[PDB]
Amino acid sequence: TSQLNELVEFLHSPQPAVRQIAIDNLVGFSAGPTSKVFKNDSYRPIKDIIKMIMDPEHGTRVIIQQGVTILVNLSEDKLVRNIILSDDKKFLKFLVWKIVDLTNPNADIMCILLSNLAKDDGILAVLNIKRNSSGEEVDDGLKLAALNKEVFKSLRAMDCLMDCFVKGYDKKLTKYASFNYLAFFFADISRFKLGRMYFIEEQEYDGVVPISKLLVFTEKYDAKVRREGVASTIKNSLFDSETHERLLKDEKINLLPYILLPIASAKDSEIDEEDMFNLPDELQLLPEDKERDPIPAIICCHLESILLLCTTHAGREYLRDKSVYPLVRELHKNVENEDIGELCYRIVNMLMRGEPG
Ligand SMILES: [Cl-]
């Protein structure tokens, strides 16, 4: 196929029917070598597609679906992501409020787009996106749908996205979405200092430290995406060792048990009675079928978190008192994976150390 260049220009035709036909024929070419065409004329096609998606009148279910599909494919390019975020600031606002709209059938692929955009630090703007009110509202030419007041108590976008992920798993808020890929969004945004601070500080709308609301999903073994993203979010949240003592000893957060459960097993582990007594309550009287997370990369991520918590003496004391060493030892014994093994002994190397001077 030759002259795609002519076809892509019809994306900014004044006639809706033309735009409709153009994007319908272009979505197929957004994957693979032919995707180069969308970067023609300083990424004009991408700007046009964004304009099409946000159109309150002509932005149909299909056009949004096809438009977002294209962007998802093209968002692999750093330069494309830059256009999506900075060229027209309102799109990111449009995107996050559409995800929160529980009547939006394209919510999940929008979560995927959002998670891809989180690779760019421009994503940090999300932390500042807020509404004047719930209920229908106009904002910089955007028609924001009314918030469901029963489930969304905040006017801040980040809080609402958190609500979707925490309460919307297994289609519990919408028949259209489970918001799994918000886990990757959380993972990538928590890499940045300002993103990390959201997750480890108490928020106003519910009076809860956000990272605590994600911990339960470390054991959701029918949602690999959720486990992966949450694991990385926990790890990123522990970047500053000066915050470790507070986070570990906050009983409302109860952080440690949800890092340890994925590496704990009922069948394999040999742990003394005295050591078992010191485990967190959640780790005792495990069910007989309790097994470790089978995916090594997830386990290693949990071990990286434990290793981070070994940075301070107070941290190491806390981990030792909770029988983290026996747990790590048995993991080392029973899971023959060199990456896991290496991390296990790095943790022991730290827990072997006494107090500095
Ligand atoms: Cl999954």
GROMACS .gro file of C-alpha atoms and ligand atoms in nm:
model
  358
    1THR     CA    1   0.000   0.000   0.000
    2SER     CA    2   0.154   0.323  -0.127
    3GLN     CA    3  -0.004   0.665  -0.075
    4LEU     CA    4  -0.119   0.645   0.288
    5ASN     CA    5  -0.007   1.009   0.309
    6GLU     CA    6  -0.316   1.121   0.115
    7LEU     CA    7  -0.546   0.917   0.337
    8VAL     CA    8  -0.410   1.048   0.666
    9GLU     CA    9  -0.477   1.409   0.567
   10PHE     CA   10  -0.851   1.335   0.554
   11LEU     CA   11  -0.833   1.308   0.933
   12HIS     CA   12  -0.868   1.689   0.941
   13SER     CA   13  -1.141   1.707   0.676
   14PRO     CA   14  -1.431   1.934   0.779
   15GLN     CA   15  -1.677   1.658   0.684
   16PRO     CA   16  -1.742   1.409   0.968
   17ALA     CA   17  -1.829   1.126   0.727
   18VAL     CA   18  -1.489   1.165   0.560
   19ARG     CA   19  -1.303   1.163   0.892
   20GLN     CA   20  -1.501   0.852   0.983
   21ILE     CA   21  -1.397   0.662   0.670
   22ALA     CA   22  -1.038   0.783   0.698
   23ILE     CA   23  -0.979   0.661   1.053
   24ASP     CA   24  -1.165   0.335   0.985
   25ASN     CA   25  -0.913   0.255   0.711
   26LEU     CA   26  -0.609   0.377   0.907
   27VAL     CA   27  -0.648   0.188   1.235
   28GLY     CA   28  -0.520  -0.126   1.064
   29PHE     CA   29  -0.202   0.051   0.954
   30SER     CA   30  -0.119   0.180   1.303
   31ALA     CA   31   0.063  -0.145   1.384
   32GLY     CA   32   0.395  -0.217   1.215
   33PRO     CA   33   0.622  -0.030   0.967
   34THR     CA   34   0.328   0.157   0.811
   35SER     CA   35   0.272   0.347   1.137
   36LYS     CA   36   0.535   0.597   1.016
   37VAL     CA   37   0.260   0.782   0.829
   38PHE     CA   38   0.102   0.906   1.153
   39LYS     CA   39   0.415   1.111   1.222
   40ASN     CA   40   0.380   1.303   0.896
   41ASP     CA   41   0.381   1.684   0.914
   42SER     CA   42   0.501   1.711   1.275
   43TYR     CA   43   0.263   1.440   1.399
   44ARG     CA   44  -0.040   1.618   1.251
   45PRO     CA   45  -0.239   1.291   1.223
   46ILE     CA   46  -0.201   1.230   1.597
   47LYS     CA   47  -0.325   1.580   1.673
   48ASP     CA   48  -0.619   1.520   1.438
   49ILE     CA   49  -0.704   1.185   1.599
   50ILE     CA   50  -0.690   1.346   1.943
   51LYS     CA   51  -0.925   1.617   1.817
   52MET     CA   52  -1.159   1.348   1.682
   53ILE     CA   53  -1.164   1.153   2.010
   54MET     CA   54  -1.255   1.458   2.220
   55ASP     CA   55  -1.526   1.584   1.982
   56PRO     CA   56  -1.838   1.593   2.200
   57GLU     CA   57  -2.069   1.572   1.898
   58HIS     CA   58  -1.886   1.346   1.652
   59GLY     CA   59  -1.683   1.136   1.898
   60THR     CA   60  -1.882   0.814   1.868
   61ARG     CA   61  -1.815   0.486   2.050
   62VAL     CA   62  -1.648   0.342   1.740
   63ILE     CA   63  -1.440   0.649   1.654
   64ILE     CA   64  -1.311   0.674   2.011
   65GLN     CA   65  -1.236   0.300   2.008
   66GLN     CA   66  -1.043   0.325   1.680
   67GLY     CA   67  -0.872   0.649   1.778
   68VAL     CA   68  -0.751   0.522   2.114
   69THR     CA   69  -0.642   0.195   1.950
   70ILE     CA   70  -0.420   0.395   1.714
   71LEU     CA   71  -0.273   0.602   1.998
   72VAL     CA   72  -0.209   0.290   2.208
   73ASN     CA   73  -0.008   0.145   1.920
   74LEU     CA   74   0.181   0.468   1.847
   75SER     CA   75   0.243   0.548   2.214
   76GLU     CA   76   0.537   0.306   2.205
   77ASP     CA   77   0.726   0.603   2.062
   78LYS     CA   78   0.854   0.854   2.320
   79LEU     CA   79   0.804   1.140   2.075
   80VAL     CA   80   0.442   1.041   2.012
   81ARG     CA   81   0.376   1.031   2.387
   82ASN     CA   82   0.515   1.384   2.409
   83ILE     CA   83   0.259   1.509   2.155
   84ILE     CA   84  -0.030   1.336   2.332
   85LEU     CA   85   0.058   1.498   2.666
   86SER     CA   86   0.198   1.844   2.590
   87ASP     CA   87   0.057   1.955   2.253
   88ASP     CA   88  -0.297   1.982   2.388
   89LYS     CA   89  -0.315   1.970   2.768
   90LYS     CA   90  -0.690   1.906   2.777
   91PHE     CA   91  -0.659   1.554   2.635
   92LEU     CA   92  -0.507   1.411   2.953
   93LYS     CA   93  -0.795   1.570   3.143
   94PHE     CA   94  -1.042   1.423   2.894
   95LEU     CA   95  -0.875   1.082   2.920
   96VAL     CA   96  -0.878   1.040   3.299
   97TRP     CA   97  -1.236   1.164   3.340
   98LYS     CA   98  -1.353   0.930   3.063
   99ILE     CA   99  -1.194   0.637   3.248
  100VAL     CA  100  -1.383   0.740   3.561
  101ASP     CA  101  -1.707   0.762   3.360
  102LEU     CA  102  -1.863   0.425   3.441
  103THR     CA  103  -2.074   0.433   3.122
  104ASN     CA  104  -1.763   0.454   2.902
  105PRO     CA  105  -1.731   0.129   2.702
  106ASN     CA  106  -1.375   0.216   2.595
  107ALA     CA  107  -1.246   0.262   2.950
  108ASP     CA  108  -1.004  -0.033   2.954
  109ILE     CA  109  -0.813   0.054   2.635
  110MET     CA  110  -0.798   0.408   2.775
  111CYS     CA  111  -0.633   0.266   3.087
  112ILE     CA  112  -0.379   0.101   2.857
  113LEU     CA  113  -0.312   0.433   2.686
  114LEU     CA  114  -0.281   0.602   3.025
  115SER     CA  115  -0.032   0.341   3.149
  116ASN     CA  116   0.178   0.393   2.835
  117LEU     CA  117   0.179   0.770   2.886
  118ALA     CA  118   0.297   0.724   3.246
  119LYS     CA  119   0.645   0.656   3.107
  120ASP     CA  120   0.675   1.031   3.044
  121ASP     CA  121   0.716   1.261   3.346
  122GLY     CA  122   0.453   1.484   3.186
  123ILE     CA  123   0.210   1.233   3.336
  124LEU     CA  124   0.267   1.406   3.671
  125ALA     CA  125   0.009   1.664   3.563
  126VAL     CA  126  -0.253   1.405   3.660
  127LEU     CA  127  -0.176   1.474   4.027
  128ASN     CA  128  -0.310   1.828   3.975
  129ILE     CA  129  -0.619   1.747   3.767
  130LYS     CA  130  -0.935   1.826   3.965
  131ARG     CA  131  -1.296   1.937   3.914
  132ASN     CA  132  -1.493   2.230   4.055
  133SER     CA  133  -1.772   1.987   4.138
  134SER     CA  134  -1.936   1.652   4.074
  135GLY     CA  135  -2.224   1.662   3.827
  136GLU     CA  136  -2.198   1.773   3.465
  137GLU     CA  137  -1.941   2.046   3.407
  138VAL     CA  138  -1.757   2.235   3.134
  139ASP     CA  139  -1.377   2.256   3.162
  140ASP     CA  140  -1.158   2.416   2.894
  141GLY     CA  141  -1.405   2.320   2.622
  142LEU     CA  142  -1.449   1.968   2.761
  143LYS     CA  143  -1.788   1.824   2.851
  144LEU     CA  144  -1.718   1.637   3.174
  145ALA     CA  145  -1.980   1.376   3.262
  146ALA     CA  146  -2.132   1.378   3.610
  147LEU     CA  147  -1.946   1.173   3.870
  148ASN     CA  148  -2.114   0.881   4.043
  149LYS     CA  149  -2.138   1.037   4.389
  150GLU     CA  150  -2.189   0.700   4.560
  151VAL     CA  151  -1.848   0.562   4.464
  152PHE     CA  152  -1.645   0.878   4.394
  153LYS     CA  153  -1.609   1.109   4.696
  154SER     CA  154  -1.315   1.309   4.560
  155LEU     CA  155  -1.291   1.579   4.295
  156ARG     CA  156  -0.927   1.492   4.223
  157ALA     CA  157  -0.854   1.269   3.923
  158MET     CA  158  -0.586   1.061   4.095
  159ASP     CA  159  -0.820   0.972   4.381
  160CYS     CA  160  -1.094   0.871   4.137
  161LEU     CA  161  -0.858   0.655   3.932
  162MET     CA  162  -0.754   0.487   4.257
  163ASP     CA  163  -1.120   0.419   4.335
  164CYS     CA  164  -1.171   0.259   3.994
  165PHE     CA  165  -0.879   0.019   4.039
  166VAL     CA  166  -0.955  -0.071   4.401
  167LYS     CA  167  -1.332  -0.116   4.363
  168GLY     CA  168  -1.367  -0.189   3.992
  169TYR     CA  169  -1.182  -0.521   3.972
  170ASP     CA  170  -1.376  -0.809   3.815
  171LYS     CA  171  -1.626  -0.571   3.651
  172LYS     CA  172  -1.766  -0.467   3.991
  173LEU     CA  173  -1.823  -0.105   3.882
  174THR     CA  174  -1.874  -0.157   3.508
  175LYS     CA  175  -1.958  -0.443   3.274
  176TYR     CA  176  -1.711  -0.282   3.031
  177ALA     CA  177  -1.391  -0.266   3.237
  178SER     CA  178  -1.186  -0.404   3.526
  179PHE     CA  179  -0.923  -0.128   3.515
  180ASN     CA  180  -0.636  -0.379   3.541
  181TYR     CA  181  -0.386  -0.165   3.350
  182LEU     CA  182  -0.417   0.119   3.600
  183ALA     CA  183  -0.172  -0.103   3.790
  184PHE     CA  184   0.095  -0.020   3.531
  185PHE     CA  185  -0.010   0.345   3.545
  186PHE     CA  186   0.048   0.343   3.922
  187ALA     CA  187   0.377   0.157   3.874
  188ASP     CA  188   0.523   0.403   3.623
  189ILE     CA  189   0.405   0.719   3.798
  190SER     CA  190   0.535   0.604   4.138
  191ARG     CA  191   0.886   0.610   3.986
  192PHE     CA  192   0.881   0.989   4.004
  193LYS     CA  193   0.928   1.164   4.339
  194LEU     CA  194   0.595   1.347   4.321
  195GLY     CA  195   0.419   1.026   4.220
  196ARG     CA  196   0.582   0.831   4.502
  197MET     CA  197   0.462   1.094   4.750
  198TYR     CA  198   0.098   1.044   4.653
  199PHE     CA  199   0.111   0.677   4.749
  200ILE     CA  200   0.288   0.714   5.086
  201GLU     CA  201   0.100   1.021   5.214
  202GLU     CA  202  -0.251   1.026   5.359
  203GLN     CA  203  -0.504   1.179   5.118
  204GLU     CA  204  -0.789   1.404   5.232
  205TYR     CA  205  -1.096   1.255   5.064
  206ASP     CA  206  -1.085   0.925   5.258
  207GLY     CA  207  -0.806   0.982   5.511
  208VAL     CA  208  -0.607   0.683   5.384
  209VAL     CA  209  -0.251   0.628   5.265
  210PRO     CA  210  -0.311   0.509   4.906
  211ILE     CA  211  -0.046   0.234   4.896
  212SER     CA  212  -0.241   0.047   5.164
  213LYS     CA  213  -0.540   0.007   4.930
  214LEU     CA  214  -0.329  -0.178   4.670
  215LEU     CA  215  -0.173  -0.436   4.902
  216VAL     CA  216  -0.462  -0.683   4.881
  217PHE     CA  217  -0.396  -0.740   4.510
  218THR     CA  218  -0.054  -0.900   4.561
  219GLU     CA  219  -0.249  -1.227   4.599
  220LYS     CA  220  -0.495  -1.185   4.310
  221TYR     CA  221  -0.382  -1.490   4.114
  222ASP     CA  222  -0.633  -1.446   3.832
  223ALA     CA  223  -0.491  -1.104   3.740
  224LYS     CA  224  -0.121  -1.116   3.653
  225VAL     CA  225  -0.123  -0.753   3.535
  226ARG     CA  226  -0.253  -0.633   3.872
  227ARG     CA  227   0.006  -0.833   4.068
  228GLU     CA  228   0.293  -0.707   3.851
  229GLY     CA  229   0.192  -0.341   3.863
  230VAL     CA  230   0.118  -0.338   4.235
  231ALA     CA  231   0.448  -0.510   4.312
  232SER     CA  232   0.640  -0.240   4.125
  233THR     CA  233   0.433   0.033   4.290
  234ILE     CA  234   0.521  -0.096   4.636
  235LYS     CA  235   0.890  -0.114   4.543
  236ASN     CA  236   0.891   0.239   4.402
  237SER     CA  237   0.703   0.367   4.707
  238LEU     CA  238   0.991   0.252   4.928
  239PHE     CA  239   1.261   0.450   4.746
  240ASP     CA  240   1.331   0.683   5.042
  241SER     CA  241   1.475   0.491   5.338
  242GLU     CA  242   1.383   0.777   5.573
  243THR     CA  243   1.016   0.684   5.526
  244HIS     CA  244   1.061   0.314   5.604
  245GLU     CA  245   1.016   0.325   5.982
  246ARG     CA  246   0.689   0.520   5.958
  247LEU     CA  247   0.549   0.296   5.684
  248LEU     CA  248   0.646  -0.031   5.854
  249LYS     CA  249   0.505   0.065   6.194
  250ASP     CA  250   0.180   0.213   6.062
  251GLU     CA  251  -0.073  -0.053   6.160
  252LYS     CA  252  -0.340   0.102   5.936
  253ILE     CA  253  -0.113   0.042   5.636
  254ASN     CA  254   0.003  -0.302   5.753
  255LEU     CA  255   0.255  -0.315   5.470
  256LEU     CA  256   0.485  -0.609   5.542
  257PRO     CA  257   0.242  -0.905   5.536
  258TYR     CA  258   0.136  -0.833   5.176
  259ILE     CA  259   0.497  -0.827   5.059
  260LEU     CA  260   0.564  -1.160   5.232
  261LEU     CA  261   0.252  -1.359   5.141
  262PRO     CA  262   0.354  -1.404   4.774
  263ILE     CA  263   0.683  -1.569   4.883
  264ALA     CA  264   0.525  -1.784   5.156
  265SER     CA  265   0.421  -2.146   5.107
  266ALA     CA  266   0.235  -2.410   5.308
  267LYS     CA  267   0.381  -2.720   5.143
  268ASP     CA  268   0.752  -2.652   5.100
  269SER     CA  269   0.866  -2.448   5.400
  270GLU     CA  270   1.040  -2.586   5.709
  271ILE     CA  271   1.012  -2.318   5.978
  272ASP     CA  272   1.055  -2.367   6.354
  273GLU     CA  273   0.766  -2.310   6.593
  274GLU     CA  274   0.943  -2.019   6.761
  275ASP     CA  275   1.001  -1.851   6.424
  276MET     CA  276   0.642  -1.912   6.314
  277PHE     CA  277   0.511  -1.742   6.628
  278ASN     CA  278   0.685  -1.421   6.522
  279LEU     CA  279   0.542  -1.411   6.169
  280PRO     CA  280   0.268  -1.153   6.103
  281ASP     CA  281  -0.084  -1.278   6.181
  282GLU     CA  282  -0.163  -1.299   5.810
  283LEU     CA  283   0.122  -1.549   5.763
  284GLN     CA  284   0.008  -1.796   6.031
  285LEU     CA  285  -0.233  -2.087   5.989
  286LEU     CA  286  -0.203  -2.066   5.611
  287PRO     CA  287  -0.442  -2.276   5.404
  288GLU     CA  288  -0.306  -2.612   5.290
  289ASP     CA  289  -0.309  -2.509   4.923
  290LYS     CA  290  -0.123  -2.182   4.987
  291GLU     CA  291   0.155  -2.142   4.730
  292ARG     CA  292   0.401  -1.875   4.618
  293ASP     CA  293   0.350  -1.642   4.324
  294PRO     CA  294   0.465  -1.858   4.032
  295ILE     CA  295   0.605  -1.568   3.825
  296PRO     CA  296   0.974  -1.514   3.918
  297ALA     CA  297   0.982  -1.148   3.808
  298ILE     CA  298   0.706  -1.064   4.056
  299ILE     CA  299   0.880  -1.250   4.340
  300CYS     CA  300   1.208  -1.074   4.263
  301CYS     CA  301   1.025  -0.740   4.277
  302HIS     CA  302   0.893  -0.830   4.622
  303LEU     CA  303   1.247  -0.926   4.725
  304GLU     CA  304   1.378  -0.591   4.599
  305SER     CA  305   1.126  -0.426   4.831
  306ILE     CA  306   1.239  -0.635   5.127
  307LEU     CA  307   1.599  -0.551   5.034
  308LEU     CA  308   1.509  -0.180   5.033
  309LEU     CA  309   1.358  -0.218   5.380
  310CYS     CA  310   1.694  -0.359   5.495
  311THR     CA  311   1.858  -0.020   5.430
  312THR     CA  312   1.816   0.112   5.786
  313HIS     CA  313   1.887  -0.055   6.121
  314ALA     CA  314   1.531   0.011   6.239
  315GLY     CA  315   1.406  -0.156   5.922
  316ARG     CA  316   1.632  -0.459   5.965
  317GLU     CA  317   1.525  -0.493   6.328
  318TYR     CA  318   1.160  -0.489   6.223
  319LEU     CA  319   1.213  -0.750   5.950
  320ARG     CA  320   1.414  -0.978   6.180
  321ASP     CA  321   1.146  -0.962   6.450
  322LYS     CA  322   0.885  -1.069   6.192
  323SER     CA  323   1.075  -1.383   6.087
  324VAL     CA  324   1.158  -1.249   5.741
  325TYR     CA  325   1.483  -1.445   5.738
  326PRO     CA  326   1.326  -1.793   5.773
  327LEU     CA  327   1.077  -1.696   5.501
  328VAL     CA  328   1.357  -1.585   5.269
  329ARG     CA  329   1.564  -1.893   5.357
  330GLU     CA  330   1.288  -2.136   5.259
  331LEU     CA  331   1.228  -1.941   4.938
  332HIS     CA  332   1.598  -1.984   4.862
  333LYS     CA  333   1.577  -2.357   4.936
  334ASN     CA  334   1.262  -2.440   4.742
  335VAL     CA  335   1.260  -2.218   4.432
  336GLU     CA  336   1.553  -2.292   4.201
  337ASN     CA  337   1.581  -1.965   4.010
  338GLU     CA  338   1.917  -1.788   4.003
  339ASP     CA  339   1.770  -1.436   4.004
  340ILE     CA  340   1.557  -1.523   4.307
  341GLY     CA  341   1.852  -1.697   4.471
  342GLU     CA  342   2.085  -1.401   4.428
  343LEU     CA  343   1.831  -1.163   4.581
  344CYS     CA  344   1.770  -1.402   4.871
  345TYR     CA  345   2.133  -1.398   4.980
  346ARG     CA  346   2.161  -1.022   4.932
  347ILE     CA  347   1.879  -0.992   5.186
  348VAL     CA  348   2.057  -1.228   5.425
  349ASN     CA  349   2.377  -1.026   5.380
  350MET     CA  350   2.190  -0.722   5.511
  351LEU     CA  351   1.997  -0.896   5.791
  352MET     CA  352   2.333  -1.030   5.913
  353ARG     CA  353   2.450  -0.675   5.985
  354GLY     CA  354   2.421  -0.520   6.330
  355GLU     CA  355   2.388  -0.153   6.421
  356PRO     CA  356   2.626   0.103   6.265
  357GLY     CA  357   2.851   0.335   6.466
  358CL      CL  358  -0.422  -1.015   3.385
   0.00000   0.00000   0.00000
